[PDB]
């Protein structure tokens, strides 16, 4: 590891600087180095890891979608053949995206999930595992796709089971997990009714628990509830 010679605290400090500078590839490399020190991550450090890789893979996903759309138009009837370049470059970006997802999944497997005993950490990491298998599923097309989809579903389901037993229905990790599992159902698993049902039940159970929250917690929970509502508006 190229970060093996840097102090854990220095890696965390530099991840925060990289976030401020919008240098998300650097941020992800610093947080990978911090994970590889072998100690568990605090709440703040888990957030830094998630922010870093979310931004890296988010740029890759946006680029892959642009290139996939160009490629699909090139394969429509009446399109003049442009050679292999669109496919090759889409494949290049796709392979890079898959590499980032595999890197994240490898960190979760070695050994973040197995050492995560508290609900807040274990649910966070299992949600991440579902998310990065979902990003793999977005580009999967072989006999690969069904197994990747099942891996995403399995991680999300384990996270859901823990979150329902151990967290209040307004907990932002629980809410973001349910949001992302509903997106999995709608966009990946061809299960829009399950997506709508999960988003509705999640929203309603959180609404009924808002009265227990402080002003700051209320703001955190309602932000994610609004995304559930925004999706329900798009889906219904």
């Amino acid at each position: 590891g190229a970060m093996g010679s840097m102090e854990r605290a220095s890696l965390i400090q530099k991840a925060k600087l990289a976030e401020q500078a919008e240098r998300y590839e650097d941020m992800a490399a610093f947080m990978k180095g911090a994970v590889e020190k072998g100690e568990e991550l605090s709440c703040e450090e888990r957030n830094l890891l998630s922010v870093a890789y979310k931004n890296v893979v988010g740029g890759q996903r946006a680029a892959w979608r642009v290139l996939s759309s160009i490629e699909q138009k090139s394969n429509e009837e009446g399109s003049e053949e442009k050679g292999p370049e669109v496919r090759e470059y889409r494949e290049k970006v796709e392979t890079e995206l898959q590499g980032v997802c595999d890197t994240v999944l490898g960190l979760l497997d070695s050994h973040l999930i197995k050492e995560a005993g508290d609900a807040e950490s274990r649910v966070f990491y299992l949600k991440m595992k579902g998310d990065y298998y979902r990003y793999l599923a977005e580009v999967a097309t072989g006999d690969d796709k069904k197994r990747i989809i099942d891996s995403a579903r399995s991680a999300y389901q384990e996270a859901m089971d823990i979150s329902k037993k151990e967290m209040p229905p307004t907990n932002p990790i629980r809410l973001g997990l349910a949001l992302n599992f509903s997106v999995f159902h709608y966009e990946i698993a061809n299960s829009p009714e399950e997506a709508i049902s999960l988003a509705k039940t999640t929203f309603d159970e959180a609404m009924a628990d808002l009265h227990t929250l402080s002003e700051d917690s209320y703001k955190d929970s309602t932000l994610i509830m609004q995304l559930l509502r925004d999706n329900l508006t798009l889906w219904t």
Binding site: N47, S50, V51, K54, D131, L175, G176, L177, L179, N180, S182, V183, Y186, E187, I224, L227, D230, N231, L234, W235
Partner: peptide, 7 residues
């Protein structure tokens, strides 16, 4: 496309 959880 659907909205997923932010940072």
């Amino acid at each position: 496309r659907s909205l997923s959880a932010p940072g």
